[PDB]
Subunit: 291 residues, 3 copies
């Protein structure tokens, strides 16, 4: 039996998360092993399986929740050999998936659905990353509601916010506590592009040119990058990226679509910190990351 | 041959239609019956499609979430002609759906499932949403819900972004007390209805719907409301009409444990305001056609 | 005639029937499940009804209700070592009711799982029962947690703003010990992650509590603050004078860390919390019924 074997096992839906680094013009290669679980010179044929991904979306999220659906990766963003040759004697070969991630919209949950048509499926959730992207701890980020023109004393918080890749040193967030799984046409309006500068200051500007959420940065946001060695595991390095910011924005889409509502102005203030666990015994900058 | 409602259907195939509650709740909804030149005198037969609605409820919500299900509108609350004649040449005709909405329980998500059984040679799942000048989705960001801890309301308050005000009659609506989930078990949910009546003198009447008042609703002070209108800066013909209600009350959540089992009620102090916005396109003389939903 | 099962309460929206069994001396307790012969005529046959465990009906329910993509919400088939019941039940000619004696051995049962005993009548000697076995003691059930404040550690000190929920479930461990999930940890989260936040609460005679984390390595960095206490009080209902309301209030304060909020896999910065306040359990007792189990109004 000929199948695929990713470094980590798939989730409850059969989707495997793969982490690819965004580098120089975002050209990066992922190596997916193909296993024969051999006295034959086998030419294995691989193809994009659009249909398995559609069936999974229906089965998991249903036709009634398309905002939660995985999106098939665009043909212009990837390339892989149609045929993989495993000579007689070998039982393992690698499928080199070459990605071109430049200008990828991380609004979508990109999946590359692969299948062995001639000797088994692989639903690869392609997650680009840089030194500033991932799941930030947002417990010190306070979101105050404007009540009678002034921010209220009572603050709302969440445990984490995702920083999505834009390029090699820029990421984006969804403003305040905006639901990261809300209607895609509506959530793209709350993107905040955050660029990491050499002097330790950040650039924070809304993605929406018309700035319908009326994003307004307060003061000069900053970031600090520090590293601690683990006590228990002495070769493990914990790398922290703390971002400190303050801004105002408005939720003008909470009523659902179509409906024009009274915007709810919010004051977002505090910090968020990203952790990256690195196994400094592994010299490769990508293989050393412990996801 | 198909149907054409003013707004396109949602993610489930259900089209929301807005019908004004008026004089004893008798209102007619004129629903276009489009053709996509018609050289035939066609007699298009319309029927209630109970089965498409049942299939949708199962497919979207499942048999295990009936509290989320759409309810087929009661036969006593609507009437429409079985046959719609579109003469040769016409290509577009209006189906007259006559509703009798008096004493409609807006606890239910009413749907009128229609189908074309004969085109005289297409479905419409109409979610009937009655409205008055005071119903819709109210902004509830200035509404604070305090939990009673050791007999006194706590300092920490909980808020939500919106609450729905459902039609009762022409000048009365209802809300679900505090932050009670508007999609919870229907038998439980109905116990938390607050009837809000808008008087001319600018004051309100707020009383629980439950005669036995099991949620121990107690109005504090006198609830008032303000109704104002502003003309838009950008679009000069657009009129923004605001209705703000100002209230304070106490109630108890005695259903959070599910059903059957008896729990310690959680008393809450609800205090603040809620505001409803209605966008009206002046230059359109009809009071229902000017609304931009 | 139709042969079926008849539990004291009717089944839920899913079709699972909740049965309450008391945790006693080494947790050995018997549940009596009646088997009924319904029909217009009198049973003139000596019927030998055959009962079996129906693994498949439970699997079908789990998939139909929660789907294959939410296994953390799934019911778990009860372990064969925790129950015993006769394979055959004899209803003699004349009778239409007999009882299936289900003998449970609940010692060391992990209440992390929603245990279901799926039963079926394979032969009526000429109907399914999905029993959700819920062990209970005098301290287990759904506690009101509105006075339980959870403060987030911001810059090494607990924040002024507190988060609360309406209820927390106290699950049976033994006859006088229960467990909770620390702070506001989701009781329906990934089970492998969920089990790490168990707090074993033991009710002592002097009115004090023992609160220790179940995880031997204490990865959640649980730290009890001061001495937690409990008070047990009773009020008689005004309207129904034989009804007794039993309250068990537990007063505690502790610190813990949520180190699993990111999902599984990638290691996150733990969020330290200060949990402080009280929780109260209500139990309604019908004093006219002398039996300690039959008197409880669930």
């Amino acid at each position: 039996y000929v199948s695929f074997k990713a470094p980590i096992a798939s989730g409850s839906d059969g989707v495997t998360t793969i982490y690819v680094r965004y580098k120089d013009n975002g050209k990066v290669t992922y190596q997916l092993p193909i296993i024969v679980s051999n006295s034959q010179d086998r030419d294995i044929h691989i193809a994009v399986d659009k249909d398995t991904l559609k069936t999974l979306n229906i089965e998991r999220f249903s036709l009634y929740r398309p905002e939660l659906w995985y999106t098939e990766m665009e043909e212009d963003k990837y390339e892989f050999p149609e045929t993989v040759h495993i000579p007689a004697g070998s039982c393992v070969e690698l499928l080199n998936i070459d990605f071109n991630l430049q200008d990828i919209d991380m609004l979508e949950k990109w999946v590359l659905p692969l299948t062995i048509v001639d000797d088994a499926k692989a639903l690869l959730k392609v997650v680009p990353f840089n030194n500033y992207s991932g799941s930030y701890t947002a417990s010190s980020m306070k979101v105050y509601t404007y009540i009678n023109g002034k921010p209220d004393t009572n603050a709302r918080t969440t445990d984490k916010r995702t920083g999505y890749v834009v390029d090699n040193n820029s990421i984006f967030f969804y403003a305040g506590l905006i639901n990261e799984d809300m209607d895609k046409d509506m959530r793209k309006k709350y993107k905040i592009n955050v660029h990491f500068k050499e002097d330790g200051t950040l650039d924070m500007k809304q993605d929406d040119p018309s700035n319908e959420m009326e994003f307004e940065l307060i003061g000069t946001p900053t970031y600090s990058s520090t590293s601690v060695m683990d006590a228990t595991r002495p070769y493990l390095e914990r790398r922290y990226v703390q971002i400190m910011f303050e801004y105002d924005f408005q939720d003008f889409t909470y009523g659902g679509s179509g409906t024009e509502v009274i915007p709810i102005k919010y004051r977002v203030a505090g910090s968020m910190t990203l952790l990256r666990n690195i196994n400094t015994q592994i010299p490769d900058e990508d293989q050393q990351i412990e996801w």
